[PDB]
Design an enzyme around this catalytic site. Structure first.
Site, mmCIF file in Angstrom:
data_model
loop_
_atom_site.group_PDB
_atom_site.id
_atom_site.type_symbol
_atom_site.label_atom_id
_atom_site.label_comp_id
_atom_site.label_asym_id
_atom_site.label_seq_id
_atom_site.Cartn_x
_atom_site.Cartn_y
_atom_site.Cartn_z
ATOM 1 N N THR C 81 0.826 -1.203 0.000
ATOM 2 C CA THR C 81 0.000 0.000 0.000
ATOM 3 C C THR C 81 0.862 1.256 0.000
ATOM 4 O OG1 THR C 81 -1.801 -1.153 1.137
ATOM 5 C CG2 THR C 81 -1.788 1.254 1.234
ATOM 6 N N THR C 82 1.885 1.294 0.857
ATOM 7 C CA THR C 82 2.768 2.452 0.914
ATOM 8 C C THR C 82 3.656 2.567 -0.317
ATOM 9 O OG1 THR C 82 4.419 1.193 2.160
ATOM 10 C CG2 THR C 82 2.771 2.417 3.420
#
Lengths: 513, 507, 462, 524
Positions: C81-82
């Site tokens: 996600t990051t």
């Protein structure tokens, strides 16, 4: 408080400047989307400049005038709202500069009203209907540019010839020579036969279905044939000799009426099928309800709701039977279709798109209707005008020499009104990364020599209708490029743009409690 | 940065705004107050702009081109500054859109190449065709005198203006060779033209000088130093050891001056002038000999006397050689102007003259003095330069026309630049209408009608507002003005617009 | 209120950059923990980027669009996600001097990012290596990356077998050139949704195909085994299933008809019954109602693979099954990416470096206006592995230049190790990552970065 | 972050130099505190009139003066290139790369560039000193300074250089052309087409005598007398006074007979010209008119130095000793009217070849009058660069040199392993400021001209030998064009001595700024 003088005239320019900057980047299809952030913190993403002005919050007497001006074009034309705001914004900036020249505002208003009526007459001289059908191509490049974002755009060159020829004949008199194209027509089918480029145009209606039992001949009644459209099935009727005796009378009214084509939505039983073999009548099982309703208009028939009407039972022979030439059935790969040609009055056709798989044809069929939408809306009005700046550039040079024909302090107002039209192609080239100073300047040189030999009724290298193509970065005719706009949209957009500009210049005082 | 360019454009507008009303003979004048407190009022833009001394560096360019405009040409110093500044005002909105200044400055020189060839096509060389010697100077003199208070008296003024330039060489003519002195009082139609020089009558004191003013052939002699005994300012103190010797101390100047008293008698010079104030010692002996003399003569007045009879100045009266003397045809001092003013007449070798004017006030004559200078500059440039073009807006409106058609045939960014260059040329006829009171909106719109019919001679009538031809109005301008102005205005415009920084050191 | 001129483009870049620069420490197994200050006495001690970004209050709307991208990316795959947020924020940072100082038109940058998106996907496919998706022992090791270092490490032997059959149940292998590529039609949300039943055993836990209901027969004496049971949702059917309750009066009427009455059926479960049955129930596999775990069950299964079902989870207690929920869903996301294509990508930043090397060499042969922004993309692709270097203690200057030089000589599978901190090979030391995450990280970051540059003015209003 | 703000302080003065180099350059008006306005287009002279505060800029100013003293040309290339090296190094400092390896990277990239300068030589100057051959070197010097005057000023400068140079070839031992051999004078009036070339110094003052010019006789003798004209007396004091009227007749007639006796001996020796550096009395000018001796007064001692190298005259500390060994010889001297005023010039015919010449400028513009005066001084040093240190070799200019070096430096970047690749790549990118500056100031689009420059030097040729056109540089356009054009058409080239010397100075200029991490100063 009460204000007046040059202070209120400067606020009108600063108010329309911030509004024009919102629609400056949204002009044309090359524009980009923007976000509207309120005090709540929510937002939205849209590329339409008309929806932005609806939710735009601006407190100003002249600023609220553009709000009603944007909604006026949306409720009727629905297109060109962005271009109207830009035109009305430049007219206010040049009008404020005339204050130092001691120009009276009524003369500025009168100069616009006289030039507006004379500009429509000049536009009506260069208007032309659809042309270049033989030797050139016009409607082909319209669907080609719209499909450039899809895989079909690669094969759209071969697909455009089938769509344009189809829709060309769809036009009909309607009510007293209306010649209005329908919004939904030309049902598109799908098949796995051969490749995507092997699709063939069928000049007529096409229905996807089979013959069920193959004991029936696929070709019969070459000279004349009648198609019987019946929503009521010929199969033995159930609840949810009495039930078997009803369907025997329904078939008796068929073979006696001379109908070689029978369409049943719920199918035909086996007992009623044996009688069709000796009569060589071609039955079809499991017909689509949405397909047969359009057949009544194409074949001149009428959909039959039920045979139980009143106390009688019959098919109403010769009343619902339409005039047709021949119904031929050709063997197709994967699913087989039915070809119906030579009806009484049809004028329509059907395009069967064959391809590798149905997954790619689903995206091509949806994109074909979207590409057809641009074509049917342009062909809806028989009077069209080339866009892309051809209206503003051709009128700019004409008003230069025409301003001398009137004069009397009104020449300065016409010159500022003509030069204010160059902002449309200017800001349009900004989003295209092209230089706006080079495109607008070189565009005037081509139109300068175009009007020199125009009144002489003789020309050699002089051509008209020079447009601006920002996709390829070159100057070409918008007629062949595929960009066409109706005349009604341009006339009402230019006339309504000046109506809101007059009410702004007439306000010399702002009274707010 | 880019902000310095805009700041330099608006800095020239304040200087140009003052020079706008000064364009034209009927326009407004600028009141300038020098640090010396001397007040000077004139319609000539040369002297005006030289008194501004603007600290701004770009404003110095307008002063430099004004000196070359007054030197090589001498006419149009106001129009060359307005035309050079108008091109910078029209280029202000073009720079805000991202257009570089180099492309705009280069486009100006493109129209200059077409303007030089246009002036040669509009230049018509005519001298003796449909004209003569007297009719050429007479018809052109009433044009500059029109719309003035002297228009009714111009009948007598033209006859004196024709003989003014005929007294000087036609190959080399200078407007400074004709002097004009303001004489208060008297009618304006009683003035006459004199070939000599006049004095200001600075002596208001009475009680001497009886002498008739009618002479036959006086001799002119120059004296570089003052020879006098009686002096009104200084005084001599005498202190000695003897009582009877107090008198002889102040007499040291006697012997050598006593001999010089009879040297003029043996020489016979009837005219004695000096640049220093002369006492009553010189005016004493000159009475019987019929020798005329005037004291407190200006330095510029003696330089005109030397070139008159061809003499020369000498320090003393001893070693003066006979070729330094000179003699005129007649010397007559009349009462014209309600005062006796000496003058010279009949000098064949005189290289200069003086045109005297009369009027009820000195300010009325000052308006006539500057008006007569405009008629001299027209004749001054009509002799050496044989190319004469129609002025007063005629040629100005023609240059803008053709340049608009040449831009349509030139592709690229030069099309808008040349079209803006021809559009900026409309400031010259506009301002001429605003200074005279005529409406510039209606005339400039109606003038463009017949201007496109093929006739290039249509001008602007300065008397009654209407469209017309300057050929019938006898409004003429030399072709040197149009050539030098377009080259100086283009160079001055491209010099200021290219300045990205203003550096000024203090200390 | 409104931002015009060139200042609006700077505010759009710094909006998404300020959020991405803070989460740079959330990438990798060495990711450093973060501490946020809430108005309440509590605090967020976890390093998960999805939990931190939702608790951060943002002002400029460009940061709000980056938050919605993290929610969509978290649903597709479990991790990474990051990575998408940092990659999308670094592209705007490298393009900042080109858009402002160099005065390059934004659409030229946007058009160049669309062309570089296609070239970036072709390089990853060449670096990827083939893998066997039919091997049951190989799929257990691929999932093991999301198993170990977690509470399930004790059940890891049983979890790899449970997660294997959970993926094999929803997936079905079908392909042809006639109807196209179905892409297996795999959905984790609706089809793989799990139901936690307390009690039982984890090893004995099996994945049943169908809908499981806890309602038993409404009659005391009835046949518990039906040859061909027919499920009917609401012909003489063999079963009667009612969504709502059924009164006792209808029990005796349908008793003589040879059918069972089943009431109290949820509405959301009726959609999954149509897959195993088709009712808008012939060929039903097993009717056995036999009780398992002191709770009456029902078997709707059959001999076919509808690709829809409800996984029955059993364990030692409810608290144990609660941790298995989020752990099993994140583990199946890696196994789902393996079935989307038989290829694997090197981890530790080797895939990020493989694109930057091939992009700089190919951009020199195009010779166009788009060549300049390609160099900014190659620099942004190198920041992802360099971010792990800054967290590994090694020299970010030395390890970045030495790693790029090895791509011209060695292979593109050589990444950076978190434990060691020196340049090592990913394949030989057993570090692997699926390619689908790499495809979704590059595509979504470029698409989101272009939308942020399309807004040149902030309109204020309702 | 003081090292970053130091670049921003130079960036404020960097944009000033970006508008200097190129045809768009303009002089700057500087008003001195003494009430004097000095106007020059040259950047090196401009820095002398500007007061520099920050010492970090002084490092670039001192490096700029080095270019003007030695080679005299290329001051704009040194300041602009050194300013760009700090911009490309700002990203490396912010990236975390230490400035130590950045300085070391420039030393490796500088040695790789100097070795490639010998292979980039296109033509070779034969040093023929022909009027047509000097047009190729002088044209780019006048270019990028004043537009439109490059055609007229090319024939005026090239003609004056050939007059002061003797006839020799392949000899570099004895130097000939100096920097003082070309003097520039100005006069009000005239134009550029009417300007001529003089073989000697031009005197714009008045002769102060009734003799306008000498005769046509060959080898006129010129004598320079430093002692003023007056009767010989005691060196200490010796003021002439009159006590009584009796001694007045002896002292007045004594000064007349003493001066006339000294002028008679000088006139008999054949000296028709007397140069008096000091004041001349009233009675001295009376005797010089009858003997036909031209009166000339040169109070400036700087003008007498170049006069001794022409005719060969020597200043005499005394008066009345016409030594024939130290006298000078000039072929012909004439007094003509040039520029509207009659002045006495100095020229030659055949013998006694002058080593100093002067070009007379004429024009109606005062601002552009001093512009050409300062522009010729930059062209004087261009002839000095024709000597042994790479005087014949030349490189293509007009932005073609900086673009071609990009492909050669980046090729050696991947060849050298290690951290040096960061400084080598940024060293080639810093050369992109030169082509972008000419395109931005001229109004050309960056999206158009710039990508065509990279495609000109980079092409795909099926072979090892280069072909097509490598001479395409940066084009200013001005009329119309598509893409770029060949520079060899206009024959605009750059000497190797100017380019090679500008690289070493610009490299050490940015090295000093990047090496200074702290600055400590105090008030004065």
């Amino acid at each position: 408080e009460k204000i007046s003088g040059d202070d209120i005239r400067n606020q009108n320019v600063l108010a329309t400047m911030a509004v024009a900057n919102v629609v400056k980047s949204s002009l044309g299809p090359v524009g980009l989307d923007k976000m509207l952030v309120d005090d709540i913190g929510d937002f939205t993403v849209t590329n339409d400049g008309a929806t932005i002005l609806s939710l735009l919050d601006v407190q100003h007497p002249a600023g609220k005038i553009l709000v009603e001006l944007a909604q006026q074009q949306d409720r009727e034309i629905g297109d060109g709202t962005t271009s109207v705001v830009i035109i009305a914004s430049e007219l206010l900036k040049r009008a404020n500069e005339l204050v130092k020249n001691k120009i009276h505002p009524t003369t500025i208003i009168t100069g616009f009203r006289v030039a507006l009526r004379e500009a429509i007459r000049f536009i009506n001289e260069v208007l032309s209907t659809s042309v270049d059908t033989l030797g050139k191509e016009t409607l082909i490049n319209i669907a080609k540019t719209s499909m450039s974002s899809k895989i079909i755009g690669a094969d759209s060159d071969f697909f455009s010839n089938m769509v344009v020829d189809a829709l060309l004949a769809v036009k009909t008199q309607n009510s007293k020579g209306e010649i209005k194209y329908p919004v939904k027509a030309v049902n598109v089918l799908k098949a796995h036969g051969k490749s995507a480029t092997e699709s063939l145009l069928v000049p007529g209606y096409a229905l996807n279905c089979t013959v069920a039992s193959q004991a029936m001949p696929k070709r019969i009644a070459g000279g004349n044939v009648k198609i019987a459209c019946l929503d009521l099935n010929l199969q033995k009727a159930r609840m949810a000799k009495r039930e078997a005796g009803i369907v025997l009378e329904r078939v008796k009214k068929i073979i006696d009426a001379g109908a070689q084509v029978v369409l049943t939505t719920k199918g035909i039983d086996d007992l009623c099928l044996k009688e069709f073999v000796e009569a060589k009548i071609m039955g079809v099982r499991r017909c689509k309800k949405e397909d047969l309703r359009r057949i009544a208009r194409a074949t001149g028939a009428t959909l039959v709701s039920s045979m139980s009407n009143l106390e009688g039972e019959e098919t109403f022979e010769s009343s619902y039977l339409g005039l047709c030439d021949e119904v031929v059935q050709a063997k197709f790969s994967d699913d087989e279709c039915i070809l119906i040609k030579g009806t009484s009055k049809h004028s329509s056709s059907s395009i069967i798109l064959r391809g590798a798989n149905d997954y790619s044809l689903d995206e091509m069929e949806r994109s074909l209707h979207d590409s057809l939408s641009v074509v049917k809306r342009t062909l809806e009005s028989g009077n069209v005008v080339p866009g892309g700046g051809c209206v503003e550039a051709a009128l700019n040079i004409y008003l230069d020499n025409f301003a001398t024909t009137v004069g009397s302090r009104e020449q300065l107002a016409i010159a500022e009104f003509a030069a204010a039209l160059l902002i449309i192609p200017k800001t349009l080239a900004v989003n295209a990364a092209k230089d706006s100073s080079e495109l607008v300047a070189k565009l005037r040189s081509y139109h300068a020599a175009s009007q020199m030999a125009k009144p002489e009724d003789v020309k050699r290298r002089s051509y008209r209708n020079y447009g601006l193509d920002l996709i390829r970065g070159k100057i070409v005719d918008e007629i062949h490029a595929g960009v066409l706009e109706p005349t009604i949209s341009k006339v009402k957009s230019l006339k309504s743009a000046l109506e809101a500009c007059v009410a702004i210049l007439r306000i010399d005082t702002m009274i707010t409690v | 940065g880019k902000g310095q360019i805009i700041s330099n454009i608006n800095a020239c507008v304040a200087v140009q705004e003052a020079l706008k009303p000064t364009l034209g003979p009927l326009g407004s004048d600028i009141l300038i107050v020098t640090s010396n407190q001397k007040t000077t009022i004139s319609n000539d833009g040369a002297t005006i702009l030289k008194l501004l001394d603007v600290v701004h560096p770009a404003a110095k360019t307008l002063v430099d081109i004004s000196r070359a405009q007054d030197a090589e040409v001498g006419d149009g110093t106001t129009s060359v500054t307005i035309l050079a500044g108008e091109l910078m005002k029209e280029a202000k909105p073009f720079l805000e859109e991202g257009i570089s200044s180099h492309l705009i400055m280069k486009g100006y020189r493109k129209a200059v190449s077409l303007a030089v060839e246009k002036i040669n096509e509009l230049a018509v060389d005519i001298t003796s065709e449909k004209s003569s010697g007297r009719e050429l100077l007479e018809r052109c003199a009433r044009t500059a005198m029109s719309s003035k208070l002297i228009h009714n008296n111009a009948d007598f003024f033209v006859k004196m203006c024709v003989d003014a330039v005929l007294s000087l060489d036609r190959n080399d003519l200078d407007d400074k060779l004709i002097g004009i002195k303001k004489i208060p009082g008297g009618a304006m139609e009683e003035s006459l033209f004199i070939n000599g020089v006049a004095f200001k009558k600075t002596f208001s004191y009475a009680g001497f000088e009886q002498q008739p003013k009618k002479f036959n052939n006086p001799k002119i002699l120059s004296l570089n130093v003052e020879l006098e005994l009686k002096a009104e300012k200084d005084n001599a103190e005498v202190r000695v050891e003897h009582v009877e010797d107090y008198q002889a101390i102040v007499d040291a100047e006697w012997q050598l001056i006593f001999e010089k008293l009879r040297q003029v008698e043996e020489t016979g010079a009837n005219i004695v002038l000096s640049k220093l104030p002369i006492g009553d010692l010189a005016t004493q002996f000159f009475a019987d000999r019929n020798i005329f003399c005037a004291g407190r003569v200006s330095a510029d007045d003696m330089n005109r006397v030397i070139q008159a009879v061809g003499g020369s100045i000498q320090s003393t009266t001893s070693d003066i050689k006979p070729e330094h003397l000179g003699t005129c045809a007649l010397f007559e001092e009349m009462q014209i102007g309600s005062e006796r003013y000496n003058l010279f007449q009949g000098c064949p070798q005189a290289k200069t003259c003086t045109l005297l004017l009369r009027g009820g006030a000195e300010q009325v004559i000052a308006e006539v003095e500057r008006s007569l200078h405009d008629a001299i500059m027209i004749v001054k440039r009509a002799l050496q330069n044989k190319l004469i073009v129609a002025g007063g807006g005629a040629t100005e409106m023609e240059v803008s026309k053709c340049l608009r058609d040449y831009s349509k045939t030139i592709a690229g960014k030069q099309q808008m630049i040349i079209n803006a260059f021809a559009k900026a040329l409309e400031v010259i006829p506009r301002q001429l209408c605003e200074n005279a009171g005529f409406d510039a909106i209606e005339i400039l719109n109606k003038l463009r009608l017949a201007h496109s019919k093929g006739e290039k001679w249509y001008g602007v009538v300065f008397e009654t507002e209407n469209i017309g031809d300057n050929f019938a109005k006898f409004v003429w301008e030399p072709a040197l003005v149009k050539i030098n102005a377009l080259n100086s205005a283009t160079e001055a415009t491209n010099l200021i617009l290219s300045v990205d920084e203003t550096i000024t050191n203090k200390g | 209120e409104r931002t015009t001129g060139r200042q609006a483009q700077i505010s759009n870049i710094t909006a998404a950059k300020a959020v991405a620069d803070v989460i740079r420490t959330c990438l990798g197994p060495k990711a450093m923990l973060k501490m946020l200050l809430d108005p309440m006495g509590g605090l967020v001690l976890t390093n998960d980027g999805h939990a931190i970004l939702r608790e951060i209050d943002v002002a400029h709307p460009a940061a709000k669009s980056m938050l919605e991208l993290s929610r969509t990316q978290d649903e597709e795959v479990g991790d990474g996600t990051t990575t998408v947020i940092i990659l999308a924020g670094e592209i705007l940072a490298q393009c900042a001097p080109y858009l402002i100082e160099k005065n390059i038109h934004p659409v030229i940058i946007i058009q160049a990012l669309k062309k570089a998106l296609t070239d970036a996907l072709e390089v990853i496919k060449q670096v990827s290596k083939p893998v066997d998706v039919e091997n049951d022992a190989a799929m257990k090791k691929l999932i093991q990356a999301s198993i170990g270092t977690k509470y399930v490490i004790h059940w890891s032997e049983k979890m790899c077998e449970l997660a294997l059959d959970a993926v094999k149940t929803v997936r079905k292998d079908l392909g042809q050139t006639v109807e196209g590529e179905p892409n297996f039609e795999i959905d984790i949300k609706r089809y793989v949704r799990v139901e936690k039943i307390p009690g039982g055993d984890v090893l004995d836990s099996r994945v049943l195909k169908g809908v499981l209901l806890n309602k038993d027969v409404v009659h005391p004496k009835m046949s518990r085994h039906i040859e061909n049971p027919r499920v009917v949702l609401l012909v003489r059917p063999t079963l009667v299933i009612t969504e709502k309750g059924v009164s006792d009066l209808a029990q005796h009427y349908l008793l003589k008809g040879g059918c069972s009455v089943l009431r109290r059926v949820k509405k959301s479960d009726n959609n999954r019954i149509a897959r195993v049955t088709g009712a808008t129930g012939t060929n039903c596999g097993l009717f056995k109602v036999e009780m398992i775990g002191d709770e009456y069950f029902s078997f709707l299964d059959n001999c076919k693979e509808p690709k829809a079902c409800t996984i029955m989870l059993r364990g030692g207690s409810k608290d144990i099954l609660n941790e298995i929920d989020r752990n099993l869903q994140d583990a199946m996301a890696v196994a789902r990416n393996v079935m989307l294509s038989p290829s694997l990508s090197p981890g530790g930043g080797a895939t990020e470096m493989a694109v930057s090397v091939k992009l700089a060499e190919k951009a020199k042969q195009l010779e166009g206006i788009q060549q300049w922004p390609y160099q900014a993309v190659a620099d942004a692709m190198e920041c992802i592995p360099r971010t792990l270097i800054q967290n590994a203690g090694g020299d970010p200057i030395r390890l970045l230049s030495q790693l790029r030089a090895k791509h011209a000589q060695g292979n593109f599978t050589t990444g950076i190790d978190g434990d060691k901190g020196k340049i090592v090979d990913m394949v030989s030391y057993g570090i692997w990552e699926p390619e689908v995450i790499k495809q979704q990280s590059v595509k979504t970051a470029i698409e989101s970065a272009c939308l942020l540059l399309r807004v040149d003015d902030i309109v204020s209003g309702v | 972050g003081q090292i970053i703000k130091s670049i921003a302080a130079i960036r404020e003065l960097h944009q000033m130099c970006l508008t200097s180099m190129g045809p768009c350059g303009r002089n700057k008006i500087i008003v001195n505190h003494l009430g004097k306005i000095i106007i020059t287009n040259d950047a090196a002279t401009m820095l002398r009139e500007l007061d520099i505060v920050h010492p970090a800029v002084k490092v670039l100013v001192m490096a700029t003066e080095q270019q003007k003293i030695d080679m005299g040309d290329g001051t704009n290339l040194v300041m602009i290139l050194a300013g760009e090296l700090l911009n490309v190094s700002e990203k490396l400092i912010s990236m975390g790369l230490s400035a130590v390896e950045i300085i070391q990277g420039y030393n490796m990239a500088r040695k790789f560039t100097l070795k490639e300068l010998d292979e980039m030589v296109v033509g070779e100057i034969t040093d023929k000193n022909d009027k047509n051959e000097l047009l190729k070197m002088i044209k780019p010097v006048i270019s990028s300074k004043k537009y439109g005057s490059e055609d007229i000023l090319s024939e005026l400068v090239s003609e004056a250089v050939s007059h002061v140079l003797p006839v020799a070839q392949q000899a570099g031992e004895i130097p000939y052309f100096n920097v003082d051999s070309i003097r520039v004078v100005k006069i009000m009036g005239g134009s550029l087409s009417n300007s001529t070339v003089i073989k000697g110094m031009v005197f714009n003052r008045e002769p102060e005598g009734h003799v306008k010019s000498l005769s046509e006789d060959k080898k006129h003798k010129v004598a320079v007398f430093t002692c003023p004209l007056d009767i010989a007396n005691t060196e200490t004091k010796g003021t002439v006074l009159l006590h009584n009227a009796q001694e007045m007749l002896d002292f007045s007639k004594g000064e007349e007979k003493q001066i006339d006796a000294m002028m008679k001996e000088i006139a008999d020796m054949g000296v028709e010209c007397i140069v008096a550096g000091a004041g001349v009395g009233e009675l001295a000018l009376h005797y010089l008119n009858r003997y036909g001796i031209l009166v000339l007064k040169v109070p400036s001692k700087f003008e007498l130095r170049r006069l001794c190298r022409v005719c060969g005259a020597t200043p005499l500390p005394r008066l009345g000793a016409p030594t024939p060994e130290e006298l000078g010889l000039v072929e012909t001297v004439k007094t003509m009217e040039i520029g509207g005023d009659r002045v006495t010039v100095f020229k030659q015919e055949q013998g006694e070849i002058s080593r100093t010449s002067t070009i007379i400028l004429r024009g109606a513009t005062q601002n552009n009058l001093d512009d050409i005066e300062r522009a010729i001084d930059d062209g004087v040093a261009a002839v000095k660069g024709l000597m042994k240190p790479s005087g014949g070799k030349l490189l293509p200019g007009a932005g073609a040199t900086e673009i071609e070096l990009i492909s050669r430096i980046t090729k050696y970047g991947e060849r050298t392993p290690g951290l040096l690749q960061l400084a080598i790549k940024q060293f080639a990118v810093a050369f992109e400021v030169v082509p972008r500056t000419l395109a931005e100031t001229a109004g050309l689009d960056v999206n158009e001209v710039l990508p065509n420059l990279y495609a000109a030097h980079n092409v795909t040729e099926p072979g090892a030998v280069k072909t097509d056109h490598l001479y395409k540089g940066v084009d200013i356009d001005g009329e119309s064009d598509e893409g770029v054009k060949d520079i060899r058409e206009e024959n605009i080239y750059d000497m190797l001595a100017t380019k090679k010397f500008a690289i070493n100075v610009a490299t050490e200029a940015a090295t000093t700024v990047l090496s200074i991490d702290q600055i400590i100063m105090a008030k004065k």
